[PDB]
Amino acid sequence: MRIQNRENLQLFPFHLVTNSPWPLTTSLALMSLALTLGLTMHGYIGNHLWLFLAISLVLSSIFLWVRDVVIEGTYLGDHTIAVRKGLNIGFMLFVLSEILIFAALFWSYFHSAMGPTIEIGCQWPPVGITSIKPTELPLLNTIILLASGATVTWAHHSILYKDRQGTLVGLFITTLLIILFVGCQVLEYTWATFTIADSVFGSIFYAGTGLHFIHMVMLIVMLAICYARMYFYHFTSNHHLGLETTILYLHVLDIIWLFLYIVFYWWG
Amino acid sequence: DVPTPWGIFFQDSATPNMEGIIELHNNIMFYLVLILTFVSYILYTIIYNYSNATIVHKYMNHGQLIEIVWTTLPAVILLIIAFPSFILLYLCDEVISPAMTIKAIGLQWYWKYEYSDFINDDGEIVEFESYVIPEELLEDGQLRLLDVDASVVVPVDTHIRFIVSSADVIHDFCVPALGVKVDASPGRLNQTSALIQREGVYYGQCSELCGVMHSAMPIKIEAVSLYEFINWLDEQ
Amino acid sequence: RKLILFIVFLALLLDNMLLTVVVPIIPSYLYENVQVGLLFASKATVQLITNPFIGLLTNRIGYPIPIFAGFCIMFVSTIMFAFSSSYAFLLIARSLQGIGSSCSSVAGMGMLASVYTDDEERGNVMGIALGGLAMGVLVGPPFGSVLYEFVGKTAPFLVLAALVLLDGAIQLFVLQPSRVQPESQKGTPLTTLLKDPYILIAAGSICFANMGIAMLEPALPIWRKWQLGVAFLPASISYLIGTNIFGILAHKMGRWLCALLGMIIVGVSILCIPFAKNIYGLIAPNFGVGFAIGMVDSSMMPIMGYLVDLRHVSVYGSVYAIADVAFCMGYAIGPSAGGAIAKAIGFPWLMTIIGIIDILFAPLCFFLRSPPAK
Amino acid sequence: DVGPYSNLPFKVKNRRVPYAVPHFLFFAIGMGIPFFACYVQLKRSGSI
Amino acid sequence: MNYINRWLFSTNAKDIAVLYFIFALFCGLLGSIMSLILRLELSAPGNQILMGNHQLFNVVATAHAVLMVFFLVMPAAIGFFGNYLLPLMIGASDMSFARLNNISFWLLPPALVSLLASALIENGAGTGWTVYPPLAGVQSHSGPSVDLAIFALHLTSISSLLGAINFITTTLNMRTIGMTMSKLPLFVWAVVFTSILLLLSLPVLSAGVTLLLLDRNFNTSFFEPAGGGDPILYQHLFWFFGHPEVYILIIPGFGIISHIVSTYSKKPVFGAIGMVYAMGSIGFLGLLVWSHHMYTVGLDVDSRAYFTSATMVIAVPTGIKIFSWLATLYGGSIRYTTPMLYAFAFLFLFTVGGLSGVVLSNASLDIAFHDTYYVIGHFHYVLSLGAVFSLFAGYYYWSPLITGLYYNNNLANIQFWLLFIGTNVTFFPMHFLGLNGMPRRIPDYPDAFAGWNAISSFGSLISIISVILFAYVIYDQLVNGLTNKQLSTNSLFKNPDFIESNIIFNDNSIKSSSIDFLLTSPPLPHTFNTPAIQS
Amino acid sequence: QFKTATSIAEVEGLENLVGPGAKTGTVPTDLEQATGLERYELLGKLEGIEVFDETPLEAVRKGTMKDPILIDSYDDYRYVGCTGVPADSHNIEWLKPTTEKNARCWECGSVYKLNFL
Amino acid sequence: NATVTNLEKRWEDLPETDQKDIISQLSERQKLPWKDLTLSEKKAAWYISFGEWGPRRPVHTKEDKLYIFWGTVIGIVISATIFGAFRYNRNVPKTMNREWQAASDEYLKSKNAEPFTGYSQIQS
Amino acid sequence: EETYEEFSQRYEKEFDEAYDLFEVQRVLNNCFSYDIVPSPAVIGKALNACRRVNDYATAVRVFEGLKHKVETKEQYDAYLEELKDVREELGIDLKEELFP
Amino acid sequence: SLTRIQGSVKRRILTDISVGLTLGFGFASYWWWGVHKPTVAHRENYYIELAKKKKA
Amino acid sequence: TATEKIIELQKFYQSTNKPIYAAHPRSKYYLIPYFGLLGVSVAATLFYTGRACFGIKD
């Protein structure tokens, strides 16, 4: 604190965020979503063009947050060594929370499977329910996820050795290789002979393998936003927290899928 | 039995299990009273001696002998309490030969009783249903919100096993004096047991919420002798 | 009958807790490849020597007497830990603990097999039984370190002795080892069991799983103060989760496939271990290794009894003694040989060789899909 | 303008209407809202 | 435009706590009036106010529980005392994620509207605080009422989770120069331990309520026993949240009391490390016991044995805290200011409340007390006399330091005495009613239970008077608050020692153990320009 | 926005911390893209200068009125917490030395003076 | 003498520029050897430093406890007056009458109920 | 862990080095805050320290703290028959002779 | 002598912990020998007379 | 100029005098539709939640 002209710059390495309007707007959009979804399901509205507007507004609000979160690290230049550690801790404590919503659904699968009720004839996948064969498309999904887990490491080892063509191609292949998972699992939902209301088996299978779908649309969006931010020269060879944050989300979903394939598709 | 106006304590017991519950409660209250009196006396001492005092003892903050004496003593109390609790939990139950079975189905806002024995070859099984008497139709001397039109009747000095199920929602079978509080789920059968030592009338009420008329679903159990049970069973 | 499983769970938990509480305290006596190796080897070798004798004696006398004897030996071992102030005396206390651990494990597994006759129930109960080892190894070191730093030495051993006394009171009030009951008929000799190959592959699957672990902890760079408490935490959680999941899933999936996948995961994790060059990098592999080991237990342990009920006479004790010998065969040989190989070739080379062997042995477990009936 | 009445979202002095009206209306509404719901639901189901 | 950029588009952490306070007052007035409506119908046998509607009685109870558990105690205890006090005590300027603070504040007003509109758009949601599955269907409650009440437990959950993440990520890497994580004050430890429970408990509640919603509206048959489901599952998936929730309300209170016991009895706290480990153990043992709420569902005989043992172990850690507070108060000097009266009234009533819990943890005795007013009277002493007392003590302690204006001592004492008498007169006879056999959630009762019900309806009218006097005390604090620091010596937080002269005292007056009470009278917007230094 | 600095002797504000740009076809380095309170750290750690100090308070000597412990501050006040001469003997007592008055630490007695920079 | 005599009845009324003059005259009067100080100065020195003025006054005076007591009494007498007004206007069912609670007594006597402590439904 | 004869030397040394009135009152405030009553010799040093600093009220309040620290009245009357020449030479008057 | 006082607070603690337990045990040996046992005695004597009438 | 405008938008976001979300000459196209449609969405969920309290359906 004895450098010559030190009072002209801050004396602590933390970010003082400027005033922003987004927290209020997201809350106002979520209020509309909640009320319109609670009413539309029981009459009172009729037209289905209000719920869509509410969802679109919520998503646009999140995107307008992330714009301001990107202009404060790449252009203004306020992300010191402390702020990056804080952001990493934050993301870890959200991944941890999103992992504990799957534990509940697994405990709702082991609580019915072990001890099947009198009503259903005592049997898993019960009489009249032909399960999904695990030597078909749900193997291509596992292999594509394992390949995706390896192709993004060739993208993070080409940005530290200063190769550009080799960090764009890896991200392209990863994005074009998580789309095939969604395509395969949207074609296995149209070749099935049991819906969400035919059993307790068709209601827990479509409720632990359907949230994964929503979580993997997010990775497609995140990888697009990381390809488009590398084409425009936004990443240095040692300051890239969008890649590190995205790679800890892909590996977690791969580990979760390896638990939705031996407990839902083999075990029966 | 019947509640008393300014009640302070349990209703009168008529089955061994309620007697055991009372004994265990009076066993725990000993230690609870000791601890409460100790804390009250220490607060009295602090208020009487150390109120607006000139001298402040600001260097007694560590403790080593005393910190082990409020960490080991409470554990001993808990073990002493836990011995009789496990003894009662594992001991008191229907170890041998239940003698009668009464199936109690709890519909929305009344009760349905069946005696699983006494069956003829054609399915002539004795069955009846219990409603609550409205306040407009009560006779002189009946209890309001506890008297019913049909009441369960059982012999004295006989093991009775209740099987409880439900048809609409989650109800709960309760007879305080008899020591019976079991649940009634829509797809499982629960069971309890009771032995009655003296004749009389035992009143009870529902526990788990079921809707609008949750306060009108009484239970009434009579304990007649064997001759009166035989005479009553040959009329229904 | 569930009280029986609770008794076995308590015995295993207390044994592993008394085995693992020391590592908070070992730096004080020690002050590391060669010195700490004897502490590891002393318990394992004594256990290995004593397993077969207990396996033979269980037919003549029965289960509860060996269980209570293991109890008394464990209590004496805890008291001997309490009053020790030299490096040499620690080895004697370790060796005394070994016999009790061996007796408790063999008798508990054999008795759980005997009481529970159905296959699926046997697997489901043995998974929960094996979970106690992971739980105790999880619970030990933090407990020891906290009491060592706060109350001082000789306090943790007294607390653990109090817990042991509670366990013994429970055992007396439940099993009541008051009479001697020989078994219905004598079992096949250990030589005949050694002749049978499938039991040999079953034992080898357990034996080869623990080499990557047993070679590693003696050489960890931990021998600050907080590091000792958390050093062994991840593997315990992984083993717990793996045992609990696969004890239920093994029967429906197929035990051979579960064993194959577990051994492959063991090999992959061991191969991934030596890439890391910092201490924190050792966090990630350990989970996987622990998890894989759990699978290889929960699927391979019950099948032993199945083989006994499919090609020999239904007398337990000796076969589960064979399983325990296979379990302990890695901690007796590791520290006394690996360092030599560490001098001979290297540490990462040894780890890579062990991982390659683990991956190679995986196909041999396909032979257990269906064995010929007797 | 840091001071004793500087961190409060509402103005307390130098004000046209006295502060007592705003202070009392807050508590009156807070303690009167739970009665309007009872009135609405009672008048929606026959009873007065 | 300056107003909008300081009170709607905000980043300062101390300006959101004031909005939390102004919201908590409103949501605590609503619940108290809805409780008075309950206690004016349970006065004498018959149908007195609500003419014959047994619906509109369950709705009142549900809105009284949800409002005063989620909209008063949590916002007051985590927002007004956590957002305001933690950064000052650990030496940080603002929190790590300020915009998430703003969103956590602003998700609550849109959550109150749904709850209020779930009681007017149809008969309502009389499902109890715990929305059990087989009653909350489309055969008993058919309308957009339960649907709109499930959505008020999602926004609040999001707000709590985002607050917890910020609190955990702020106390780790935003400390001063010389504060290792063993010299932290006790309040920060309490907030961290509660923020971990919020992370580990909320997702299970979210999953359970969402599955109930799907069962209602998309006929999926999760908990319907005609397709292979069990209602009991919901119970598990609720009560995993049920018990940790109950501790989230009480751990922040404990730390507050500690500060008072350390300041008005001039002695440091007895065994701080013991207290931190006690809080940690209480937090950890609150996750391994949740099935003592359901002993009558038909569990095994070896599952009752585990939970009857794992529940009584919590008594050990709390005894350490109680005895430590007594040891702190023992040797020192005690001056009876208004926060210390509340602190003293918390050591005794909370003990009476927690001792009855050891009588209900047994599986054997629970067949005499479950679904009875004994449980009710048990939890009022711990909730109404344990947490609200701590909130009042914290307010009367830190209000002058935040606003810069003092309050009348006499009216505060009057309010405290009225609250004491009312709360001890309203909740005690419920023990007798529970012992004699009165069930829960019933509008009308048999003729025998009349007398005590007439005594518990007399205390509520004494507590509402205390609330009104609190309103007037706030009014007298805001107006003429500058001239209420000479009436009494309650203003001084530490009085002169025996040898310290008045002249020397007036030069060196502020003595503390934290940065809290050395700050300017209203704290500056940017409090720390140059970093604080610790040895 | 103005002349770029090459060492922390030429950093007179936030106007001297923009820097040149990378070339087309290359992954930019941190010396070719860094603007605010980030590049100040980079320019300080390439010389051995730590811009953000983390050195605790002096616990070597006590403090007399004639010879007081000097705390450096860029304002007129700075909060200092005393824990003793052996550095952990005294409990934590907080003090606010100012440009017109000195802190004195009621239990041990150390006096602190403020040096305005 | 007048300046210092009987400072127990004038100290809190003087301004803060006449209080810093007496202290600055007893501090050059204490440097002389004691036993040369008058008794009035000895009393004044004790009162100025260790006395019941300023920060050494009690939290509760004698005229504040009566105020608190009679504020609580008048706050308990209002709840009693409000609760009684809600007690005259009640719905009394037909069962709560003495001639009805004495008929239930005969029924509970015939079917022996509460052989222990007691049965009685009479509460007027 | 300190004995009587170490307490009664450490506080003599600390009292024979105070340079102001704040320091004298500080050292007197934490002398009467242990389980040991200060010895008759230590109080003899405290009065000389109060005489160097030129304070009269502190020399009279010191005797009034002994009246509260001591358990009984005979010990107080035994302190005043050995701390008597120090008073009649310095000139200190007890509070019960002034009636302030 | 009368001018050497060393420990006073410890004896206070010991005399205040040895009287808060005597009072506690006094108020707890009245719950088990004055409120509990006579009730059980009355209950048993009632049952030892309801059987004699049936026998006769 | 070239793809490295990064050394040209860093001299703009500093020395701006406007909020960061309304500084570029492009934020109009994002900010007008959003604030326009939000006031319609929030004004349609308060017309059907007061119209439902009166019992009116569609």
Ligand code: HEA
């Ligand atoms: C908010 C306060 C609070 C707290 C802290 C706790 C925690 C505890 N609760 Fe919990 N509890 C509630 C309030 C609270 N609870 C509520 C509202 C419910 C649900 C009600 C409903 O759903 O309708 C519930 C759930 C619930 C139930 C289920 C009730 C039922 O069966 O219907 C029970 C008892 O069975 C119980 C008891 C306990 C106990 C023993 C503790 C223990 O943690 C308390 C420990 C306290 C002490 C032990 C005092 C220690 C004092 C000392 C001097 C120590 C001396 C040593 C000993 C006494 C040996 N609680």
Ligand code: HEA
């Ligand atoms: C949050 C805890 C809480 C609180 C505050 C209260 C408040 C009160 N409660 Fe309790 N009560 C519960 C816990 C609580 N209750 C719960 C969980 C239920 C629902 C149970 C179920 O679902 O069945 C319930 C329901 C309930 C009932 C209905 C029970 C039924 O029929 O099932 C009854 C009486 O019948 C009762 C008693 C009372 C009374 C008389 C008050 C009143 O005396 C209120 C007391 C007054 C105050 C506490 C003043 C509050 C102070 C302020 C608002 C200022 C706040 C201060 C600051 C912000 C600094 N409560």
Ligand code: CUA
């Ligand atoms: Cu019926 Cu409850």
Ligand SMILES: [Cu+2]
């Ligand atoms: Cu609980």
Ligand SMILES: [Zn+2]
């Ligand atoms: Zn100091």
